[PDB]
Structure 1
Amino acid sequence: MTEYKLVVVGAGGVGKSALTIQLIQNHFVDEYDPTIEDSYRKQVVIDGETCLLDILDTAGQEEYSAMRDQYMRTGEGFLCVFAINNTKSFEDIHQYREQIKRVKDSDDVPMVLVGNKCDLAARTVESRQAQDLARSYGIPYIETSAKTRQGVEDAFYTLVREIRQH
Structure 2
Amino acid sequence: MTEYKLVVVGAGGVGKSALTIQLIQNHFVDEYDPTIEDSYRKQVVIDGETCLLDILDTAGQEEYSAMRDQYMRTGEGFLCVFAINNTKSFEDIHQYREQIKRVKDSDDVPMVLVGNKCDLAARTVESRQAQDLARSYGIPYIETSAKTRQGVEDAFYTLVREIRQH
Distance 2:20 2:116 in 1: 12
Shift of 1:109: 0.3
Distance 1:121 1:165 in 2: 35
Partner residue, 1:110? 110
Distance 1:155 1:124 in 2: 21
SS in 1 for 2:33: coil
Partner residue, 1:139? 139
Shift of 1:99: 0.2
Q: Are residues 1:80 and 2:80 paired? A: yes
Deviations 1:79-122 (A, max 9, x none): 00000000000000000000001011111100000000000011
Shift of 1:164: 1.2
Distance 2:129 2:145 in 1: 19
Shift of 1:66: 1.8
Structure 2 residue runs without a partner (length 5+): none
Partner residue, 1:59? 59
Distance 1:158 1:138 in 2: 14
TM-score by length of 1: 0.99
Partner residue, 2:157? 157
Deviations 1:138-163 (A, max 9, x none): 00000000011000000000000010
Distance 1:66 1:85 in 2: 27
Bigger shift: residues 152-161 or 62-71: 62-71
SS in 2 for 1:90: helix
Partner residue, 2:94? 94
Distance 1:56 1:43 in 2: 15
Aligned length: 166
Percent sequence identity is 100
Shift of 1:65: 1.1
* RMSD, matched Cα: 0.5
SS in 1 for 2:94: helix
Deviations 1:43-89 (A, max 9, x none): 11001111100000000001111220001000000000000000000
Shift of 1:35: 0.2
Structure 1 residue runs without a partner (length 5+): none
Deviations 1:1-50 (A, max 9, x none): 20000000000000000000000111000010000000001111001111
